[PDB]
Design a protein around this ligand. Structure first.
Ligand SMILES: Nc1ncnc2c1ncn2[C@@H]1O[C@H](COP(=O)(O)OP(=O)(O)O)[C@@H](O)[C@H]1O
Ligand SMILES: Nc1ncnc2c1ncn2[C@@H]1O[C@H](COP(=O)(O)OP(=O)(O)O)[C@@H](O)[C@H]1O
Ligand SMILES: *SC[C@H](NC(=O)CC[C@H](N)C(=O)O)C(=O)NCC(=O)O
Ligand SMILES: *SC[C@H](NC(=O)CC[C@H](N)C(=O)O)C(=O)NCC(=O)O
Ligand SMILES: O=P(O)(O)OC[C@H]1O[C@](O)(CO)[C@@H](O)[C@@H]1O
Ligand SMILES: O=P(O)(O)OC[C@H]1O[C@](O)(CO)[C@@H](O)[C@@H]1O
Lengths: 444, 444
């Protein structure tokens, strides 16, 4: 009824004249033998939830273990008859759960990913008890895969080169790790939604996503997690990101708008076409925004492309078509507010980087399902997408560097994405702007 | 490179100077005993896919059967020893599949929902053969539920009042239908993803959504279907929709903008508050847009609410803040184009109803997961949402009637939504505008 508009995020809020006074968090429990992609799922899911704004953190019991033990000697550390190490392993689990408690009850976290094997009913029972007693929801993710080819390949890809094997050649690293896995085999009790685990909320991922069993999804975040797990795959592939060729507003320093390519932006577009041909890709999808400059760039390729409105550049609202010099002059306060809080700032009647993230989510979801893809887009859009793939925070996203006429080439390696930059050697202007009391204290 | 902007949808396209020259469709196969919600899933999924723009149609073999037989006498028609009727039933299935073929190969349909029991391997095999031979993808949805309470309740809710029982009282309708179900029991072969159905793409829905088994999702549309099935529920509930109280742009005939409530819009807001209290709901969620007028309306309720940017009113781009009389005067061609194709039309630098649908999809998905919800929104937004619940086409959506100060109350009944209108007796202006050669032929 009486409301004021917040100056940064442009949100209407009730005017509070007295500010002097005055949906449980969730633990995701990983389950499975070693080298089943538990840690891979932990990190990727966490990169997703963070980028869409649900604060999430991975608690990797193995890293608590390395912290406490220092150098790994061999699989003998994991024998079920190793009384002292079984004890230390338990201690690492319980220290991880203490931090889980602190994260969720004290540091404003919403999702805690408890990444360990959790292969016995007894250990899962204790985790349930800890969640109940603290009022957290529990959701279980079990990865099941007995294909020896996938296990072998997982070991080569992430295990022989982990810190546990700093000292090792490949063949013996592999040999140690195989025996380490067989340590857990005799006591492993897979999740059983028919009998014993009927009242648990869970997903079983089977044969790398070929099949899934889902029991009792409870809420908003749980059903998204399941949809996300069902749409990612481990096939190797490549993602290319770039901006439209230089346009005429770029030549004028003007933001937003819908102008066409300059003669350089056009020369870039032919360079992009030769570059793509030289990559020699089997099938390649091409995506653009609905703005003219990205579409003119894609036409030079002579490949089919799809236009997405969700890839249009951030909307500057009343500042569209203006230069930054015009904005500082006409809207000095809006100018200063954007520089102090560039992620959360919304242009009047336009958008923030925060809004851009929400709108790009379906683009990200579909990119997960594709193989080879080239995305021709815009400066602020490209920073968002890059923040997702490279795991950058919200505070750094609006400052990521993404110059004109340069392709960022992303390849899946280990637990994330390697980025490689290829500048296509066509000049263009620079659109990157770096991050930028006296009277308001006494002795005025 | 050389492109033109389409006048209605504002899409850049290559200029074609010679227009004189020049991802398989999918059959969804329903599977299950009678009264397992197959038809319910068929219709609801189809209402969803159509509203998000994937042309879909239900082929209900039972309706082919009623067409061909005329009056139903009893469950004896469904006996496996009824040689002549087994023949006619088969004929209805094959006539349905012919129409499926015509819909998908000839009428531009993309998804065909084949709604029948399909309870034997032999019948499913023939459907596979028909899909293969025509190059369609096949995806199976099996509903499994042996809770006698749910079956009984499903029969009371949709079967005793179906056309098959026009002639009948409740007890005997129920009795006939129970025996009809037991006709199919002996030969029923549930989908078996372990052995026989390992290479099929399928979802098994178990105990009304308590549990799911998912085998080999293949593509974009299949993974959305699964996510949609996992998020709807049959618990009874109520959805309320209305607009912000009247605002000052409403008093001026002006479109878009961010103005506050008039004194009437405020009187409506207290009326809404008393109305909500009189409904006596257990928990009620309240959603608004981020525009001031909806938020001022929600404050009068003194209940917690959530603001969604996706509920903001359609964006009129360069025409924001203008009256319709100013738009006709300054942009006569844009005015005329919008009147001739109101769904697909996009305001320059703004949106169409088509864009509004894409942006509201997450709102619809989340409404599916809720129980009691009140959505305070805007004229064009409210028509979109109402088109989804009431199954209206794209061509009618922009003309649906949704006056100020009136709540639309939606309740789940049978296979859809009943709508009830409650006007809260506060005057307001009217914002509804109805749908509106000579020189371009010779004898000029
Ligand atoms: N669902 C899955 N099943 C089996 N392997 C997977 C799965 N998802 C990812 N991977 C592979 O798992 C490997 C990483 O294993 P890691 O996450 O370190 O396993 P863990 O934590 O279970 O010991 C990567 O090679 C990745 O490709
Ligand atoms: N997954 C499900 N399992 C069981 N019943 C359901 C399911 N989904 C909806 N229903 C109920 O099914 C009833 C409608 O049955 P109907 O679709 O006519 O069944 P069928 O087509 O299998 O004969 C409705 O009462 C609805 O609430
Ligand atoms: S199902 C709960 C568990 N009980 C059993 O394992 C009995 C055998 C299985 N239930 C079965 O065959 O059905 C349980 O709590 N086990 C404790 C453990 O640590 O193994
Ligand atoms: S699995 C393919 C089917 N063969 C069988 O049913 C053999 C028995 C089961 N496979 C089993 O117990 O594993 C099949 O095609 N059956 C044809 C039918 O119409 O029943
Ligand atoms: O967030 P920033 O750095 O202002 O960059 C986004 C701007 O960059 C541009 O893409 C090019 O200058 C403008 O169209 C857009 O407003
Ligand atoms: O699609 P239509 O009928 O022009 O209605 C949408 C318009 O209605 C209003 O909500 C109220 O007039 C405007 O804010 C908006 O532009």
């Amino acid at each position: 009824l009486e409301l004021t508009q917040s100056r940064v995020q442009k949100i209407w809020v009730p005017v509070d004249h007295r500010p002097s006074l005055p949906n449980s968090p969730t633990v995701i429990v990983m389950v499975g033998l070693p080298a089943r992609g538990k840690t891979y799922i932990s990190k990727k899911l966490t990169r997703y939830l963070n980028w869409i704004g649900v604060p999430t953190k991975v608690f990797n019991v193995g890293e608590y273990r390395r912290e406490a033990v220092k150098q790994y000697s061999s699989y003998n550390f994991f024998r079920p008859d190793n009384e002292e190490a079984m004890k230390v392993r338990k201690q690492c689990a319980l220290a991880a759960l203490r931090d889980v408690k602190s994260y969720l009850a004290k540091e404003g976290g919403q999702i805690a990913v408890f990444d360990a094997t959790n292969t016995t009913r007894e250990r899962r029972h204790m985790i349930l008890h800890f969640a109940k007693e603290n009022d957290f929801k529990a959701f279980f993710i079990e990865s099941v895969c007995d294909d020896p080819t996938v296990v072998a390949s997982n070991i080569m890809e992430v295990k022989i080169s982990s810190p546990d094997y700093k000292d090792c050649n490949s063949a013996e690293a592999m040999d140690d790790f195989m025996k380490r896995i067989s340590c857990y085999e005799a006591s492993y009790q897979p999740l059983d939604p028919d009998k014993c685990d009927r009242d648990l909320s869970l997903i079983k991922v089977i044969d790398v996503g070929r099949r899934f069993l889902v029991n009792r999804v409870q809420d908003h975040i749980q059903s998204r997690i399941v949809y996300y797990l069902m749409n990612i795959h481990v096939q190797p592939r490549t993602i290319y990101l770039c901006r439209h060729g230089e346009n005429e507003h770029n030549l004028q320093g003007r933001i937003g708008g819908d102008s066409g390519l300059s003669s350089r932006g056009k020369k870039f577009a032919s360079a992009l076409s030769k570059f793509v041909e030289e990559q020699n890709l089997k099938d390649l999808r091409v995506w653009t925004s609905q703005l003219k400059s990205t579409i003119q760039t894609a036409e030079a390729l002579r490949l089919p492309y799809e236009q997405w409105k969700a890839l249009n550049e951030i909307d500057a609202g009343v500042c569209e078509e203006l230069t930054y010099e015009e904005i500082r002059d006409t809207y000095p306060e809006e100018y200063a507010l954007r520089e102090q809080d560039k992620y959360y700032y919304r242009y009047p009647t336009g958008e923030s980087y925060q809004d851009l993230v929400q709108r790009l989510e379906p683009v990200i979801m579909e990119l997960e399902r594709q193989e080879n893809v080239l995305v021709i887009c815009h400066q602020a859009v490209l920073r968002c997408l890059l923040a997702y793939f490279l795991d950058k925070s919200a505070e750094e996203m609006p400052y990521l560097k993404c110059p004109l006429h340069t392709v960022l080439k992303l390849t899946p390696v280990a637990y994330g994405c390697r980025v490689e930059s290829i500048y296509l050697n066509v000049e263009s202007v620079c659109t990157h702007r770096e991050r930028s009391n006296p009277l308001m204290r006494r002795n005025s």
